Amino acid sequence: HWGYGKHNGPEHWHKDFPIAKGERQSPVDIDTHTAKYDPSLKPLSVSYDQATSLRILNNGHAFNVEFDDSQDKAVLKGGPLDGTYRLIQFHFHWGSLDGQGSEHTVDKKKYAAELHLVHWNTKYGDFGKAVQQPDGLAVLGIFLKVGSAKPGLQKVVDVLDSIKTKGKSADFTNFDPRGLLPESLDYWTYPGSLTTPPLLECVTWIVLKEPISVSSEQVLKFRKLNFNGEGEPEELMVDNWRPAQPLKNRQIKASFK
Ligand SMILES: COc1ccc(C)cc1NC(=O)Nc1ccc2c(c1)[B-](O)(O)OC2
Numbered sequence: 729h730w731g732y733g734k735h736n737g738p739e740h741w742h743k744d745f746p747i748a749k750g751e752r753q754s755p756v757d758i759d760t761h762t763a764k765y766d767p768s769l770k771p772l773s774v775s776y777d778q779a780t781s782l783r784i785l786n787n788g789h790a791f792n793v794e795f796d797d798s799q800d801k802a803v804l805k806g807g808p809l810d811g812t813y814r815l816i817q818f819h820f821h822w823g824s825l826d827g828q829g830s831e832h833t834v835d836k837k838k839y840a841a842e843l844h845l846v847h848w849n850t851k852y853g854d855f856g857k858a859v860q861q862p863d864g865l866a867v868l869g870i871f872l873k874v875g876s877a878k879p880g881l882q883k884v885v886d887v888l889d890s891i892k893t894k895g896k897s898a899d900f901t902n903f904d905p906r907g908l909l910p911e912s913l914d915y916w917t918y919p920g921s922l923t924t925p926p927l928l929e930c931v932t933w934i935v936l937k938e939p940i941s942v943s944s945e946q947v948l949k950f951r952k953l954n955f956n957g958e959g960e961p962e963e964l965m966v967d968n969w970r971p972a973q974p975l976k977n978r979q980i981k982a983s984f985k
């Protein structure tokens with residue numbers, strides 16, 4: 729199965745998932761001088777006050793904090809989006825070193841990690857149906873740089889010991905994702921895809937310009953997780969990011985002048 733090692737990493741994915749070489753793959757490099765300000769972009773609306781987190785799971789390629797999306801609680805709307813998108817989960821991609829780890833890059837700059845808050849278009853009824861649509865998901869991407877600790881991230885860091893290996897999960901209720909957002913909601917947006925197999929081209933990417941800062945100790949704990957299952961040879965969960973893909977026939981739009 730696919731992963732991030734030399735023998736099953738990003739360069740191999742196209743054999744089982746031909747869409748890997750598709751027309752709207754993610755991530756991409758964001759060339760800040762080429763992205764054009766779009767005055768028509770409506771303001772972004774992130775309404776997470778009623779978010780209901782439930783569990784945290786190590787799925788063998790990252791850890792997902794899952795939410796109750798059986799009702800319209802936490803939603804994302806506005807910006808380039810038509811309609812309402814419901815939060816279902818968030819996860820991160822990070823490196824073995826502070827100098828790499830993000831999937832999107834800014835003028836080729838790689839951040840230490842990148843957070844993906846995943847939302848699905850409620851007009852499609854459920855997540856599985858949504859990923860089959862070009863406007864099925866809206867993912868909010870937030871860069872992480874190493875510096876001061878992010879208070880709102882500590883509850884996540886402290887539970888990682890309990891989900892060290894693939895397939896382990898733990899109760900994770902009452903977590904407030906608002907604590908993972910930067911001050912400004914200025915963003916870049918473009919049509920793209922999931923960055924892991926099946927690599928479906930169903931995502932409207934909304935990548936925030938302002939990164940959040942996390943401490944070296946916080947990201948060091950991410951790097952202690954395992955890709956393997958319990959009782960298997962230890963493979964540290966690091967560098968679970970896909971590199972920038974061809975922009976092709978797409979334009980990245982900026983929400984700010
Ligand atoms: C085997 O994987 C699946 C099987 C069946 C279904 C319906 C969905 C998936 N995968 C999926 O949703 N991935 C996924 C979801 C959200 C995001 C990413 C990947 B990302 O681009 O990294 O960040 C945001």
Ligand SMILES: [Zn+2]
Nearest residue numbers: 819821844923
């Ligand atoms: Zn992701």
